[PDB]
Subunit: 217 residues, 5 copies
């Protein structure tokens, strides 16, 4: 109906994710060979999100609850790719080690795992939330003042601007998710749909813009 | 049947939209790298329209009413892309700022939002209609005598002709939609199907023609 | 079963149309950029035909009648593209005006519209049939002794041979359809399936052969 | 179950055919423009076979019999393409007339038509079988000591080896099908599934190997 | 639910396999023509695995058992391709005979066939397990100290590193499967899902990394 404001968002986000997947997979022609992997991973993130959103909508229609397990599965598939996009754009613009890829991957996995262990009641909410936030802040530090920044200082100003915009998304766009978690252990589906919009489409658009600019110039 | 003249139009428009989506995604080979983004966005518009038309047909078969929410969702996804096609073709032919992209996007969003707020009864029909028409006229001015025209004067005559044809579509092809709104607050589905034909397929065909001409010459 | 000889033809034609669509969309690699649009339109015709044949088969399974409206929808989408293939191949081989594109399009539309107005009983069978035949003969004249021939005389002999073969298809392959109409107003589904084979697959194969020859040589 | 040994083969062959279709359509990048048509036709054969095998499996699940009509439809679509692959590989390696294409096509069609006329009881089993075998042997002669061999003697040794391997498949791999026919008019579904494996996947693999070798060297 | 830990793994692995298939088919642009076949085969393995995992999930939903036949069908299609990836990467980096391709294929087929003959009770568990392990060790020897190693010593150090990593996967990643077999004849579905992750996605990622490095450098 026109009063829930949740199914409307579900449909809007699902169609936008499909559109973004097609856009990312098609626009690899405008970028050089180095940036094609970044655009491919961006498109993979949007496609996996669309894939899981279809089943989440199906479960919403059948039962009418929140599929926490399905959202965490989508996260366990997409958050590592989104965090490794930093390594990808740094590799397509300068010499990045790959140690960064490893540590970012590990941090994201830890963050998700402990978050789920708090969601499922396996571990007490406070401890799991604190550990997940520590993993989040560790990824933030690696992208802000750690190895990621050291690789960022040897890149082109366009790549640096894209890196900073993506970092701001990781700090403020991502902060939506733990906040809801906090609220759950002391609207959410709508908030997560809009947040996935911001964190799945705008992220890839920033990557696409910088890749196209670098290839053209 | 052969008397409604509405389901026939639904099927015709849906098949035409699918055909147009395939055509736009396939014909990116004849255009240069700069015009590929324009053709991609055109194809995305047609694909989203087809996607939502399938579900609108499903709802028509099940219940048999007009899905206003679904049409406005399709609009909220396609109208911004269609209006940003102006920025796209100006970027693939001259130096356009991107401020135009921003302002056009904002105007289209305002137009749609206020239109829906009048459709759902949230805001009185008159005020919302006036605000939406002001947003429409603001987009018209930006494409006619504003920043869009300033970027248009530094383009090739073929690009200028495509720009003027698209502007005439924005003025007269788009005027179909508010008129129906006016009539609703004082056939429509058939009119909107034919209008989507005009405003979703002919628009992309104009873009494709100018892109192919520019790439070939 | 093995006695109707109609469902067998339905399946054969549907699979052949899908195969032809894939072939046309894939074989655009062997042709130059100019001929890619012709191959794309050919593939679009076969794809739309396949698309509508699936639903015609569904209606045949459910009810078991002849969907005149569905066939005329398929025609209203495919006949204009097939007739504009002449303009396409003339544009990819010499200087054709585009006035030809306009007049051919108009003639095909008139032919289909009046034919349907005779099929639905809106207009008397004789007058509508005569007007449709006049439109058919006008297209024949434009392709035989009119503007189309003038553009044909300035083309390569391979393109001229393809043009003449396509013209013979337009004269004799297309004459199947009005004949049935005549018989209806004084087997048909099987005849139309085989005719669609001839007029949808062989036509595109002639176009593909000439395009490949021109690109290779 | 694990005792029929027929549904297992159905699933294995169907998945292999889909895999082969994707492989053939994807691997056109490693071949020159001349060999792309051969790879496309190979992929079309596998795709049509997969398409019809899906419906054959559906009919097997519903009723549980042998769809002779469906197999002969698949043959009427695939056998001409498989036999014309000889003309294709000869055209992409030397000067072949195209008369070969015509005569091979005619022979294959005659073989299939008379075979079906014997299967459906229209014509006596003996006469139809003899005529079909004569058509088969005529195709064998045209590929062994006729026009096909004359075109083969002017090709590269790799193309000659591929031609001979394909000829051995036409002689011994194809002989599976009439033998079953003989047995039927005096296990079969399993035999035909494995034979389609041999005659639909190995054939295309031989073609792909020779095309890749010719393009690389 | 959140307690089985098996359906979660099923969904995770299925989505990851689809993502990997798309990634492998898309990333063929960054590799040279020689490595395209390796990436294609990798993508085929992931696609076949996804294809069969969908039906395995369907059978799990309907009945709720372990489809041994379906897993062995997936193996009979994917294990030969995975083992022939060694020949592929050796061919795209040095002169490998193809005798290796033959012997590896034969060994994998023997391993699978005898394994199934032990699973279905056709042959006693001990003898079939011993023969399958002998085939496994024969493949290990051919990749470690046999013809595969001789071809490996004439390759680039990056290709040698990829070869050694793949060999370690064949030794330790693959050892998961017979161990379960042993346990079955004296959790498993979860173990096989995670093992397919390791042996279907990481394998292709190693291949993709080495191919991209070789093409770039
Ligand atoms: C596309 C989906 C994305 C990008 C999801 C991101 C989710 C997070 C960044 C979640 C973070 C969490 C914490 C920092 C606290 C622990 C629980 C969380 C998982 C929600
Ligand atoms: C593909 C769909 C398109 C291009 C829809 C366009 C819709 C409009 C331009 C609607 C305009 C309206 C006004 C100017 C008045 C307010 C209400 C409206 C939204 C129908
Ligand atoms: C793919 C479908 C095609 C090419 C259909 C073509 C149909 C015609 C050329 C029909 C012609 C007719 C007349 C000339 C008389 C009026 C009625 C007709 C429409 C069947
Ligand atoms: C993919 C399917 C293929 C290649 C089928 C081939 C079938 C034949 C070569 C059948 C031959 C027959 C005869 C020679 C005798 C007449 C009856 C037949 C049709 C089975
Ligand atoms: C993608 C699936 C893969 C790579 C499956 C691999 C399976 C094996 C390597 C199985 C090996 C076995 C033995 C060595 C003992 C005999 C029984 C087995 C088949 C499970």
């Amino acid at each position: 109906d026109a009063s829930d404001y949740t199914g409307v968002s579900f449909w809007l986000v699902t169609a936008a994710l499909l559109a973004s997947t097609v856009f990312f997979f098609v626009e690899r022609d405008r970028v050089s060979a180095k940036w094609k992997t970044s655009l491919t991973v961006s498109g993979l993130v949007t496609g996996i999100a669309f894939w899981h959103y279809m089943y989440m909508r199906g479960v919403w229609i059948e039962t009418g609850d929140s599929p926490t397990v399905f959202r965490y599965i989508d996260w366990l598939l997409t958050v590592p790719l989104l965090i490794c996009e930093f390594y990808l754009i740094l590799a397509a613009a300068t010499n990045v080690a790959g140690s960064l890829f490893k540590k970012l991957l590990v941090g994201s996995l830890v963050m998700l795992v402990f978050g789920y262990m708090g969601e499922a009641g396996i571990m007490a909410a406070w401890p799991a939330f604190i550990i997940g936030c520590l993993a989040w802040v560790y990824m933030i530090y690696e992208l802000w003042a750690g190895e990621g920044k050291s690789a960022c200082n040897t890149a082109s100003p366009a790549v640096q601007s894209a890196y900073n915009t993506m970092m701001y998304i990781i700090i403020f766009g991502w902060a939506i998710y733990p906040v809801g978690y906090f609220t759950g252990y002391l609207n959410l589906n709508l908030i997560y749909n809009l947040a996935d919009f911001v964190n799945k489409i705008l992220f890839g658009l920033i990557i696409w813009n910088v890749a196209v600019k670098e290839s053209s110039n």
